[PDB]
Amino acid sequence: SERPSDLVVNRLVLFVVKGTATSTHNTVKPLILLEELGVPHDIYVVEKVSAPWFSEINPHKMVPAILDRSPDGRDTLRAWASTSTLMYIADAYDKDGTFGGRNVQERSEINNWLTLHTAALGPTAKYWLYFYKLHPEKLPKTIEKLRSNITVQYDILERRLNEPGQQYLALKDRPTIADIATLPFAMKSTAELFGLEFEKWPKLQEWSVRMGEREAVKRAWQRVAGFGHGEKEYGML
Amino acid sequence: ERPSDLVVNRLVLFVVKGTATSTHNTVKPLILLEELGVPHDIYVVEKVSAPWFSEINPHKMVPAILDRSPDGRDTLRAWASTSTLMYIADAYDKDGTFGGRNVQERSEINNWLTLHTAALGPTAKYWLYFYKLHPEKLPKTIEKLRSNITVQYDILERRLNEPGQQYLALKDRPTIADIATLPFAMKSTAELFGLEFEKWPKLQEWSVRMGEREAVKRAWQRVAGFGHGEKEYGMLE
């Protein structure tokens, strides 16, 4: 119930933790979109996500999460989980549909590829990492199946990116929240973690590099790695 | 090459023959089509492995949708149950009765829709797979997945114990968040998972309230019946 004294919501507040490697792969997604749209925001570094006040924001007790002001009526809004934070930021701040889609056709494909990540590659990658670290089995029977499912997901993304003129996952000519949700789970460093040779998916690799060259993506990666390592470790930066 | 009977004269919902284990995701868009009274065709897919079908859903699963864009220029597609709900709400729920009417409502709809899409939905699917479909029993895996189901039921119970919170996203009415959750949070499903649904009394009350809606009753009867009618596979009458 009791919130930290330095937690005030004058604009969008993105909740993150001091982390490294896979601990930043979900938090980086909303940060990429905020950087893409030039949305004004605060970063709040959560010291304990197990604190009662944090579960009032995200009942799953994970980052990323958002507290924001109402469009008007200065009320408080919340978004939690990376996919939901992308939906919220697009709804509240992408009124042109640059990343959210400009018509029912664009939104249909964006939601197809966003949901493929939310339901398939995301949860599969999460379970693979959990069972990898746990190592409960003499023979890696569980992670074997999960890793097979990851290659099926890479095959789908590769198939899509081999279609004529299909430069991004949802739309042919620009990245959307689908591309942002997928990038951390379809880049060379993550393939290597899963024990895969990313060069086996050349169009997916090309797409990850094209996405990685965007200034907003570079800035988000730089910022997410820096959070809580600066002058101020925890609280409002 | 598509079957000769596959023509897109309006929304076409792709399903498979109704069995005890084939309907928990296909029922979701069907519930929303019934709530909104959207005119639609049903196409019973004989084999989801068929090449024509992977041109629609590259993940080779139902539900999927083909429909015509309102601008008359394109045939569009939606695939995975969450994306089909998003698409039907976008195209056919102009008032936002199920999709949300403003940034505030949509913030909560997307929180609870994404929670189902990322957590309970995939956890349930993996529990099912490792429990009965995987050639070897992996009890450490199966028990963790089942424990993960009870954590999701705990989150939904906590939410439905908040004051006046009659539904998951909104206090006042059901949304695509409630439709997405219901098939994996009702007594018959809890019994399939080997759980006592009475342990979450507010979640159970909610499931009964959802189950009494005419759209839900109709959708369950129709989805069970598909492929058992006068036409077995293909475009139904």
Mutate which: B62, B117, B123, vs A, most A CBs within 10 A: B117
**Tokens 């509240």 belong to residue:** A92
Round to whole Å and give the CA distance between B60 and B80.
10
Three-state DSSP class for residue B27: helix
For this PDB entry, the determination method is X-ray
Taking Cα atoms as reference points, which of A116, A209, A184, A194 lies closest to residue A151?
A194
Q: Domain range spanning residue B186?
A: 103-215
Q: Which residues on chain A are in Cβ contact (under 8 Å) with B128? A: none
Q: Which residues on chain A are in Cβ contact (under 8 Å) with B104? A: 70-71, 75, 77
Q: Does A119 touch chain B (CB under 8 A)?
A: yes
Q: Which residues on chain A are in Cβ contact (under 8 Å) with B130? A: 142
**Tokens 């024990």 belong to residue:** A195
Cα B199 vs. chain centroid, distance in angstroms? 24
Q: Does A142 touch chain B (CB under 8 A)?
A: yes
Q: Judge: B102–A156 Cβ closer than 8 Å, yes or no.
A: no
CA trace torsion A27, A30, A36, A39 (10° rounding): -110
Residue B75 φ/ψ, nearest 5 degrees:
-95, 125
Q: Judge: A120–B59 Cβ closer than 8 Å, yes or no.
A: yes
**Partner-chain residue, chosen from A71, A88, A115, that has the shortest CB–CB distance to B82:** A115
Amino acid at B40: H
Q: Judge: B118–A123 Cβ closer than 8 Å, yes or no.
A: yes
What's the token pair of residue B46?
Answer: 């004989």
Sign of CA dihedral B165, B169, B171, B174: negative
Any alpha helices (H) in chain A, and if so which ranges?
A: 28-37, 52-55, 82-93, 104-116, 122-134, 141-161, 177-182, 188-193, 202-212, 215-226
Q: Residue positions of B in the annotated binding site?
A: 25, 62, 81, 125
Q: Which residues contact A30 (CB under 8 A, 6 or more apart)?
A: A14, A64, A66, A79, A82, A85, A86, A89
Is the separation of the CB atoms in A121 and A147 below 8 Å?
A: no
Q: What is the CATH number of the domain that holds B175?
A: 1.20.1050.10
Is the separation of the CB atoms in B75 and B89 below 8 Å?
A: no
Which residues does residue A113 pair with via DSSP β-bridges, in sequence order? none
DSSP string for B129-192 = IIIIISSS--HHHHHHHHHHHHHHHHHHHHHHTSTT--SSS-SSS--HHHHHHGGGSSHHHHHH
* H-helix or E-strand spanning residue A235: strand A235-236
**Tokens 């004294």 belong to residue:** A5
Round to whole Å and give the CA distance between B127 and B132.
9
Nearest residue of B to residue A101 by CA position?
B90
Q: Does B56 touch chain A (CB under 8 A)?
A: no
Q: Does A136 touch chain B (CB under 8 A)?
A: yes
* H-helix or E-strand spanning residue B187: helix B187-192
Q: Judge: B90–A104 Cβ closer than 8 Å, yes or no.
A: yes
Round to whole Å and give the CA distance between B167 and B56.
33
Is the separation of the CB atoms in A64 and A85 below 8 Å?
A: yes
Is the separation of the CB atoms in A174 and A94 below 8 Å?
A: no
Q: Judge: B159–A91 Cβ closer than 8 Å, yes or no.
A: no
Q: Judge: A115–B71 Cβ closer than 8 Å, yes or no.
A: no
Q: Judge: B111–A81 Cβ closer than 8 Å, yes or no.
A: yes
Nearest residue of B to residue A149 by CA position?
B59
Round to whole Å and give the CA distance between B117 and B216.
20
Is the separation of the CB atoms in B63 and B85 below 8 Å?
A: no
**Tokens 């989150």 belong to residue:** B155
Q: Does A148 touch chain B (CB under 8 A)?
A: no
Nearest residue of B to residue A110 by CA position?
B83
Is the separation of the CB atoms in B106 and A91 below 8 Å?
A: yes
Percent of residues in chain B assigned helix, strand, coil, to nearest 5: 50, 10, 40
Nearest residue of A to residue B109 by CA position?
A84
3-state per-residue secondary structure call for A117-175 = HHHHHHHHHHHHHHHHHHCCCCCCHHHHHHHHHHHHHHHHHHHHHCCCCCCCCCCCCCC
Closest CA of chain B from A230, distance in Å: 31
The size of the A-B interface in CB pairs under 8 A is 131
Q: Does B74 touch chain A (CB under 8 A)?
A: yes
Q: Residue positions of A in the annotated binding site?
A: 26, 63, 82, 126
Q: Which residues on chain A are in Cβ contact (under 8 Å) with B176? A: none
Mutate which: A70, A112, A177, vs B, most B CBs within 10 A: A112
Q: Does A85 touch chain B (CB under 8 A)?
A: no
Mutate which: B48, B110, B147, vs A, most A CBs within 10 A: B110
**Tokens 């997901």 belong to residue:** A153
Amino acid at A64: P
Nearest residue of B to residue A146 by CA position?
B126
Q: Judge: B104–A70 Cβ closer than 8 Å, yes or no.
A: yes
What's the token pair of residue B123?
Answer: 């956890």
* Intra-chain end-to-end CA distance of chain A, in Å: 22
**Partner-chain residue, chosen from A75, A81, A104, that has the shortest CB–CB distance to B115:** A81
